[PDB]
Structures are given as C-alpha cells and as structure tokens.
Write a protein that binds this ligand. Structure first.
Ligand SMILES: Nc1ncnc2c1ncn2[C@@H]1O[C@H](COP(=O)(O)OP(=O)(O)NP(=O)(O)O)[C@@H](O)[C@H]1O
Ligand SMILES: Nc1ncnc2c1ncn2[C@@H]1O[C@H](COP(=O)(O)OP(=O)(O)NP(=O)(O)O)[C@@H](O)[C@H]1O
Ligand SMILES: CC(=O)N[C@@H](CCC(=O)O)C(=O)O
Ligand SMILES: CC(=O)N[C@@H](CCC(=O)O)C(=O)O
Ligand SMILES: [Mg+2]
Ligand SMILES: [Mg+2]
Lengths: 258, 258
C-alpha cells in the first residue's frame, strides 16, 4: 500500500485526558478520510518522570538521553512499554480503532545495541525489518510502538522516542511527524522556527538556542529527512483545531528540510 | 496448522535467571522438534508483588483475585504488560526466538469486561477473536501474551493470568499447560494430586484443601478442559529435567479431566 505515516507522541500529552480525546478524534477522522496507513510511536518521559519522581529516583539526562542504570531498566520498561503503550491502546479501543501494541524488538522492527556504557541501558536505534508491521498494516491494524528495545543478547534498552521513530521511519519508508508540547523548534526569543536545515541547526546549537532533548529531536528529524528524501515536521499536539490540517500536511510547526 | 499449545507462566519464575534459562532451553528444544505452534501467556504477581511491596501498597486479594483500585491499574499494567512481558521477550530474543509481545486487547484476542465493582479494575476474560494470533503463528512468530486487557470503553483491566490463558485457549482451540511454582494441586498433606475432576475439585474446596489462587486456577483449568474436550495440565517449571517430557505430554503434575 502507500507509504505509511508515523505519528510520534510524547511529552505531557499523557497527562491530559482532554488532549488525548481531541487527538484520537483527529486520528479517527484522518484514518476515515485517508488511505495512508498510520503507525504511532510513543515515548513518555511523562509517565516515567512522574514515577521516578515519586520513587525519589534522580533523573540524570546526559546529552538529552536519560542515564538508565541496570537497576532501573525494568521499572522504566514498565512505565514505557507497559503503562504508556497500553494507555494509548485503551484510547484506541475507546474510539473503535483496531490497534496492536508493540515494542522495538517485535519482528525486529528496529535494531538496538548499547549506545554508550556511560548511559547504561540506553539503546542506539537503527533500521530493522518492516515485515511484521507491514503485515499488520495490510491487515488493517494500527501499530502503536513503544521506544523500549532489546539487544540480540537479550538486554532491554531504553531508546529516545524521537530516535526510535526515525529508525522506524527508515525501516518502513514512512513519512514522519514528531508531535511535542511546543510548536516545533523555538528561537532565542521563544518563537517558532518555520523551516530547518542542517546548517541552521548547527548554527542554533552553536549559539546554545537548541539544547537538551531538542538537540536529540532535531538531529533525529534531520537524519530522517535525509534518509527518506522527504521533509519531516515537528509540531504540537496541544491545539485541537490545528490537528486535522497538520495530519494533512499543513506546516504548523517546524519543517525539517534535508 | 495444528492446534497451538499455550504454555502459561507465572509465580516466582521471573525471579530466577537460572529457571528462565532452563525453561527457554526447553522451549527452543520443543519448538525445533514439534510442529505444534507455541503461544505463551504469562502473569507475574511476582514482578507486581515485589513492586507493590516496595511501594508500601497493600495486596488485598478477594477470592483469589487482586483488588485493583483505579489508582493502581497503571502501575500494575506497567509491571505486567510492560516489565514481565518484555523480560520474557528479551529471553526469547536471547535464544533466537522470533517473539511478538501482546496483551489481551490486541486483535481483540480475549474479550474483557469489569468483573465486579468490589474488585475495581479486574477483568472477566472470555473468548475473543483468534485472527491476529493465528496470523502471527502462521507467519512463524511466538506470541507472548500478558494478562492485562481493556474494555470496549477503554478501561484497562487486570485479569487473573490463569483465566486469561483459559479464555485464550478457547479462542484458539489450543491445548493448555499451566506452569506454577508447585507440582500441580496438592492435598491436605502437601502431596501432588495426579488427576482432577470437577467433583473432586468441589470436594477439596469444601474441605478447605484448595484455597485462594488455587481455587481460581483449578476452576480455570476445569473450564478449559470442558470447553476444549481435552485434558489440561497444571505442573511445575522448577525442575529442568521434567520440562521436555512435560511439554511432550508426560503427566508431571495434576491433569484436569473434563
Ligand atoms: N531551542 C529549543 N526549541 C524548542 N524546544 C527546546 C529548545 N531547547 C530545548 N527545548 C526543549 O525541548 C523539549 C522538547 O524535547 P522533549 O522534552 O524530549 O519532548 P518529547 O520528545 O516531545 N517527549 P517524549 O517522547 O515523551 O520524550 C521542549 O519542551 C523544550 O524544553
Ligand atoms: N490445595 C492447594 N494445592 C496447591 N496449591 C495451593 C492450594 N491451595 C492453595 N495453593 C496455592 O496456590 C498457589 C498457586 O496459585 P498462584 O499463587 O496464583 O500462582 P501462579 O498462578 O502460578 N502465578 P501468576 O500467574 O504469576 O499469578 C500456590 O503456590 C499455593 O500457595
Ligand atoms: C534514553 C532515553 O532518553 N530515553 C527516553 C525514552 C522515552 C521518551 O523519549 O520519552 C526516556 O525518557 O527514558
Ligand atoms: C486480577 C488479578 O488477580 N490479577 C493478577 C494478574 C497476574 C497473575 O495472574 O499473575 C494479579 O496478580 O494482579
Ligand atoms: Mg524527547
Ligand atoms: Mg495465579
């Protein structure tokens, strides 16, 4: 069929029932008016941070990535691959969407290896096999993929959701939209930046405008854009009225050009 | 293809790396010497209890079922559908098994509804659609199914793993083996009971020999046995040497006759 569209979800989205309702309303409307099959990839520092907080566990993120010790991978996996993933599956069911929950290791959709011993159980995601997901898409299911992966040696890995989404986009040859709490990438004044290139990203990074998580998000988007040969959008999930146009192609945030 | 074989896992199994290794060794050996496709269903009060314990959260089980308040369903879902499920997926990968993680709601494999308001988010599992799992089995994957489900209204439900396994057995017309920490059902002296009938189960229950969780396990096994028209075994996963014969049909625990 057509190239699928991957919609990546994350941020505080999971903390808002209203936001989730409006989002799924837009997803149903899109699905029932488009032939391009959808695939959802999600993160959830939201469900994770709140949990780590309650557990008095520190949240150290080295260069945008969460240091994930061996004694914390199981609980993080529970929050991400379990709670976040199933919460989204429940919303899909509530809206009569036939969804199937998956993590990066299912059907070896996305290959993961240990990125850096200093990060612990943090995985480096690279393209895998599209066979399983393609079969699910052809059968009419909506794959909802978490960012937890597993190495060939059987070690669970926590993968940044933006990087996981980009790896899956390459695997499926899918278009990609990264939805976040903010309207794309902001400049030094907090204003939305309409278009992004590698040269500009480098500039902004050199100037300290793009920091933390956003450095990881932009680099992931740029990688996807150059791999696919198609633009990649970073936009917000916060405003109901913008969702339909967004899912249809209207630039609502930052469009990465490669 | 042939009627699949569902192997249900639970208990303290997840706390033993050695036990997990020996189990998967036996699973690989079985798979490579049998045409009957395997399906794993798992519980995990193990990963859940230890977590609830550390959280100073009480574990109240009414009539063998864990009272699951709305404020605890997310964390239980994380432990069961996330941690337990992915831990098993990691072991499968370690042994080069192409597995796919699922929960009861995927492909509506097992239908779930609220069992009793007094239990909270505890689901009543009944047969669903075998289409998704049958397709995965035909494609060569090993489904690993958690006991978390979801109602049509989008509410996550915690389902007793034995009941979930029985509901799935009916859905798939699968043979069933329930693996636990003990060698089947024990009598008043703690000795293994070789065969079980509904009449005998009633007797033992009336005599207070079969209590708690075991009442739920036996009733689930008896239901499966009468639905399938085939015997159902309850046996232990603790002894390495018994696994091969067990998976092949040798009675190692309690065989439920219907
Ligand atoms: N120049 C910048 N422009 C925009 N956002 C920035 C910038 N620098 C840093 N950020 C941060 O980038 C965050 C975006 O990345 P991130 O916090 O990981 O959200 P997410 O990827 O949407 N969620 P999730 O998948 O759950 O992690 C924003 O909310 C900002 O705090
Ligand atoms: N007459 C009995 N015979 C055998 N076991 C009994 C009996 N009465 C109670 N039990 C208990 O039944 C338990 C078996 O059920 P359960 O504790 O829920 O394990 P499980 O279903 O294997 N694990 P899981 O899926 O993770 O919940 C045993 O370990 C015993 O504590
Ligand atoms: C390694 C890493 O940073 N992981 C992310 C995965 C979830 C996400 O992107 O929201 C994390 O916060 O734990
Ligand atoms: C409702 C209910 O008892 N659920 C089970 C599910 C896991 C299992 O069987 O191990 C529970 O302990 O939370
Ligand atoms: Mg992020
Ligand atoms: Mg049990």
């Amino acid at each position: 069929m057509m190239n699928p569209l991957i919609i990546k979800l994350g941020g505080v989205l999971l903390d808002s029932e209203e936001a989730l309702e409006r989002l799924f309303s837009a997803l149903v409307n899109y699905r029932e008016s488009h032939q391009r099959p959808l695939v959802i990839v999600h993160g959830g520092g939201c469900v994770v941070d709140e949990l780590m907080k309650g557990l008095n566990l520190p949240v150290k993120k080295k260069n945008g990535l969460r240091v994930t010790p061996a004694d914390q991978i199981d609980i993080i996996t529970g929050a991400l691959a379990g709670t976040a993933n199933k919460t989204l599956l429940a919303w899909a069911k509530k809206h009569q969407i036939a969804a199937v929950g998956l993590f990066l290791g299912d059907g070896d959709s996305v290959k993961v290896t240990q990125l850096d011993e200093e990060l612990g159980h943090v995985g480096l995601a690279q393209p895998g096999s599209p066979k399983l997901i393609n079969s699910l898409l052809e059968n009419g299911y909506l794959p909802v993929v978490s960012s937890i992966g597993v190495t060939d040696e059987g070690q669970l890995m926590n993968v940044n959701a933006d990087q996981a989404a980009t790896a899956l986009a390459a695997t499926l040859g899918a278009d990609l939209i990264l939805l976040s709490d903010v309207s794309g990438i902001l400049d030094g004044k907090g204003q939305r930046i309409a278009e992004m290139t590698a040269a500009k990203a480098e500039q902004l990074i050199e100037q300290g405008i793009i920091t933390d998580g956003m450095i990881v998000k932009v680099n992931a988007a740029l990688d996807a854009a150059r791999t696919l040969g198609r633009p990649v959008d970073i936009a917000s999930w916060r405003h109901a009225e913008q969702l339909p146009a967004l899912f249809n192609g209207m630039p609502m945030g930052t469009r990465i050009l490669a």
